Amino acid sequence: RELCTPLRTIMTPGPVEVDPRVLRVMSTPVVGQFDPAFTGIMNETMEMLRELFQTKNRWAYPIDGTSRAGIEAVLASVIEPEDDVLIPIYGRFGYLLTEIAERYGANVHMLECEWGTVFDPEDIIREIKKVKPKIVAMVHGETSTGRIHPLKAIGEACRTEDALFIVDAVATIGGCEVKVDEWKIDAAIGGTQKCLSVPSGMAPITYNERVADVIAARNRPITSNYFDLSQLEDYWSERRLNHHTEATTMLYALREGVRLVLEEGLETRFERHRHHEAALAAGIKAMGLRLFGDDSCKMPVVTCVEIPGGIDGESVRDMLLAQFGIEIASSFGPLAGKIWRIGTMGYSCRKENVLFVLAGLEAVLLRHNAGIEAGKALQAALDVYEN
Amino acid sequence: RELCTPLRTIMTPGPVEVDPRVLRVMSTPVVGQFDPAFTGIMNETMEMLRELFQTKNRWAYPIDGTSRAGIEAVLASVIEPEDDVLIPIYGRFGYLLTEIAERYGANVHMLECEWGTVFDPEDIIREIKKVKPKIVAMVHGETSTGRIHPLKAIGEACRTEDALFIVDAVATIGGCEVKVDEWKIDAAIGGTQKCLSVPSGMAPITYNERVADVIAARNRPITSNYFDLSQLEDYWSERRLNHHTEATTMLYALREGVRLVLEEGLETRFERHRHHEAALAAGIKAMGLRLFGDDSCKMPVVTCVEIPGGIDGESVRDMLLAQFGIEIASSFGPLAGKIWRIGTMGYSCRKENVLFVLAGLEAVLLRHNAGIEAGKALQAALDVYEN
Numbered sequence: 065r066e067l068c069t070p071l072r073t074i075m076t077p078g079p080v081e082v083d084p085r086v087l088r089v090m091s092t093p094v095v096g097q098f099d100p101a102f103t104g105i106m107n108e109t110m111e112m113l114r115e116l117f118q119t120k121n122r123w124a125y126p127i128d129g130t131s132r133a134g135i136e137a138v139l140a141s142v143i144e145p146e147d148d149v150l151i152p153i154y155g156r157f158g159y160l161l162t163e164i165a166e167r168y169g170a171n172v173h174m175l176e177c178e179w180g181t182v183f184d185p186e187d188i189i190r191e192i193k194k195v196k197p198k199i200v201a202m203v204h205g206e207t208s209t210g211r212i213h214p215l216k217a218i219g220e221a222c223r224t225e226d227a228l229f230i231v232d233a234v235a236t237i238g239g240c241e242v243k244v245d246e247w248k249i250d251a252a253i254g255g256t257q258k259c260l261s262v263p264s265g266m267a268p269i270t271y272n273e274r275v276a277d278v279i280a281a282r283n284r285p286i287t288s289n290y291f292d293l294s295q296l297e298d299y300w301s302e303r304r305l306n307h308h309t310e311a312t313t314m315l316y317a318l319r320e321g322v323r324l325v326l327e328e329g330l331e332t333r334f335e336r337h338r339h340h341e342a343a344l345a346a347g348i349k350a351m352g353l354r355l356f357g358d359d360s361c362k363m364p365v366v367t368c369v370e371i372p373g374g375i376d377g378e379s380v381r382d383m384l385l386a387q388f389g390i391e392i393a394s395s396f397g398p399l400a401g402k403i404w405r406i407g408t409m410g411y412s413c414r415k416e417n418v419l420f421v422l423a424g425l426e427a428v429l430l431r432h433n434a435g436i437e438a439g440k441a442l443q444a445a446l447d448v449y450e451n
Numbered sequence: 452r453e454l455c456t457p458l459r460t461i462m463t464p465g466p467v468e469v470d471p472r473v474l475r476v477m478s479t480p481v482v483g484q485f486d487p488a489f490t491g492i493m494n495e496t497m498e499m500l501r502e503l504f505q506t507k508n509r510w511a512y513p514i515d516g517t518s519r520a521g522i523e524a525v526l527a528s529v530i531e532p533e534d535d536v537l538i539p540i541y542g543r544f545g546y547l548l549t550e551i552a553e554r555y556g557a558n559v560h561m562l563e564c565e566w567g568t569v570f571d572p573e574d575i576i577r578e579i580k581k582v583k584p585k586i587v588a589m590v591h592g593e594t595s596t597g598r599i600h601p602l603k604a605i606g607e608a609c610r611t612e613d614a615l616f617i618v619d620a621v622a623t624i625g626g627c628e629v630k631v632d633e634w635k636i637d638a639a640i641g642g643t644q645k646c647l648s649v650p651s652g653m654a655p656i657t658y659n660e661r662v663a664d665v666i667a668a669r670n671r672p673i674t675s676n677y678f679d680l681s682q683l684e685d686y687w688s689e690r691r692l693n694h695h696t697e698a699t700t701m702l703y704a705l706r707e708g709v710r711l712v713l714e715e716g717l718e719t720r721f722e723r724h725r726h727h728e729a730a731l732a733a734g735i736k737a738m739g740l741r742l743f744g745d746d747s748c749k750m751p752v753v754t755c756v757e758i759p760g761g762i763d764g765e766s767v768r769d770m771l772l773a774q775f776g777i778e779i780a781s782s783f784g785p786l787a788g789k790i791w792r793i794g795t796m797g798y799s800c801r802k803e804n805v806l807f808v809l810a811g812l813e814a815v816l817l818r819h820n821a822g823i824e825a826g827k828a829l830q831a832a833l834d835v836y837e838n
């Protein structure tokens with residue numbers, strides 16, 4: 065009755081596999097929040113998060129919940145009843161931002177486009193100019209539709225218009241370029257279990273003086289005590305204000321998981337994600353499958369494969385897991401039954417996984433009488449791995 | 452540049468040392484939230500939490516957050532602006548409950564007594580009858596003061612007056628008796644890094660149909676999306692609502708930590724916490740030191756030792772740490788400089804740690820001069836272990 069779990073090959077958009085070097089560190093005996101060993105770990109983790117987010121911000125630190133708690137914590141700390149919040153939505157995660165904003169009493173201005181595509185930044189900028197929102201909140205990369213949004217012009221427009229540009233980089237941080245200072249992002253929130261390959265359940269964040277200034281003004285309480293950044297900043301600085309018992313093991317794992325990213329090198333790691341995305345694409349293509357969505361804003365780290373006429377996609381996903389231990393994602397909501405989503409993130413983004421997922425998917429589709437030519441998919445991925 | 456950390460002897464009231472069986476399991480490769488392997492771990496964890504809390508409640512499951520995010524999610528889900536909430540406060544964590552409740556728009560009625568004592572339940576029950584609150588929120592064991600509060604008479608009055616009795620059992624669960632059905636507790640929240648000896652960063656909760664019907668009536672939604680128990684209940688049952696990525700590794704750890712408590716036996720485990728408490732106590736006494744606080748309501752898992760006049764309590768704590776790797780807690784706020792708090796919780800509650808903490812504290816107190824005698828401390832703890 066000790067735990068017994070299968071070894072999966074995980075090719076969803078998250079949570080993804082964790083590097084063995086992060087796994088092994090989690091068996092390390094704990095130290096307390098106020099132990100000098102712990103404060104040294106905290107401090108180094110903040111420095112690594114500044115390089116990771118490509119920022120000089122004084123404020124780069126983790127919060128103890130999932131990705132969404134991190135997003136909630138930022139938005140809660142900068143929204144007051146009736147502030148205008150502009151939110152451009154092109155996928156499922158844009159609606160989470162609106163749910164959060166509205167819950168904290170914001171007047172929410174939304175824009176929407178066709179799932180599968182992205183906005184012209186110009187349409188967002190014009191709306192910024194028109195409404196003069198306090199906050200523009202946006203998803204960098206929507207795993208629901210597989211698109212990644214250009215953010216630089218939008219950031220520069222928030223800064224000229226004196227808006228705070230708040231970004232959910234949960235699915236992109238550690239996998240796709242995210243440049244907080246260059247794109248004039250005012251606060252960014254990441255997550256651990258996607259491209260960083262750290263166990264789910266912590267949310268690294270960063271924000272600049274413009275965001276901190278607004279937080280310091282809070283005059284009326286931030287509604288969530290646990291998500292109060294004015295007390296979280298006292299935690300993550302010399303005061304060591306006893307706000308909550310930071311998560312010991314999870315901090316050890318984040319520390320290691322970010323060290324590994326920086327060892328790889330950011331640009332090298334980005335280019336490495338694109339390389340495996342290319343091998344996957346060529347296999348899927350040779351297999352006779354089509355990709356969903358606008359190919360010019362394709363998120364590098366998620367691939368959206370169209371489910372063919374007359375095949376049950378749930379049945380394919382379930383056989384893949386039950387027979388091969390291979391996990392990919394369906395869609396629930398507007399794209400339900402239209403696509404599978406194959407993630408290539410973090411430790412899961414490697415040659416052995418890309419090859420196993422194509423072999424797996426080919427075998428399961430031939431079993432469901434998909435019209436494929438057997439053997440083409442793997443040859444096309446191996447061609448990219450050799451070349 | 453890999454993590455390197457000292458091995459501490461942790462004798463604070465949290466976070467404490469983790470059983471090695473829980474540690475080794477955190478190196479297991481992750482599976483996803485929607486993988487049957489993970490739903491199987493979910494379901495067994497919920498059964499075990501029913502036993503841990505001594506309840507039949509359908510609702511017993513962790514939320515991803517420190518203990519006080521657990522507390523916040525329960526209070527958020529049950530409080531609408533202007534609800535009356537009675538909070539009897541006898542230590543520091545009583546004020547966190549009032550903070551959270553006020554922030555959610557409650558009209559808070561507080562009672563406050565002297566730190567180091569508890570209420571006569573008849574005074575509380577009289578305020579219940581008078582205020583007729585929707586909710587009574589209370590701490591079971593205040594580690595800040597070392598007092599544990601009787602709960603049964605209070606829960607019985609809450610049930611007859613049709614108030615919800617919501618209990619912070621964070622410091623007591625798995626260490627001291629908690630009987631949620633018997634004491635007519637409507638909602639209880641635990642934490643992991645205390646008597647459970649699970650890495651901090653999750654909060655096991657339980658609640659009954661009285662609590663669940665108020666959550667279902669939510670008309671005005673709960674302000675926190677992440678702490679929305681109404682969505683968290685669809686997460687932790689048949690429909691598998693995608694509310695958040697459960698924290699994979701922290702769930703492994705909770706599962707194993709609760710399994711170990713249940714293998715020990717709740718009553719055996721509570722008696723084992725008493726045994727070590729008694730040995731620590733005879734050691735502290737024979738050392739010529741005094742305990743703070745009302746002996747009739749002493750929390751079994753914390754022991755508050757009076758700092759003798761002319762001894763810098765911080766200097767003593769720092770030296771124990773720096774030389775012996777032994778960690779004890781100071782107090783901040785009203786008890787600052789009056790007491791050290793020595794925790795005997797979970798895996799830290801063991802004869803080796805009890806012996807080492809007395810040996811270390813004896814040598815340090817002698818170094819600070821130190822009107823104590825000898826090997827009296829150890830012989831007296833050894834006498835109790837021998838009997």
Ligand SMILES: *Cc1c(COP(=O)(O)O)cnc(C)c1O
Nearest residue numbers: 308309517518519544594621622
């Ligand atoms: C220590 C403690 C807490 C703290 O919980 P965190 O995991 O630090 O959020 C809350 N309530 C009580 C009684 C405590 O002793």
Ligand SMILES: *Cc1c(COP(=O)(O)O)cnc(C)c1O
Nearest residue numbers: 130131132157207234235695696
């Ligand atoms: C997965 C995801 C989130 C939130 O993730 P959780 O860790 O499950 O709370 C937010 N934004 C994007 C784009 C995501 O993919």
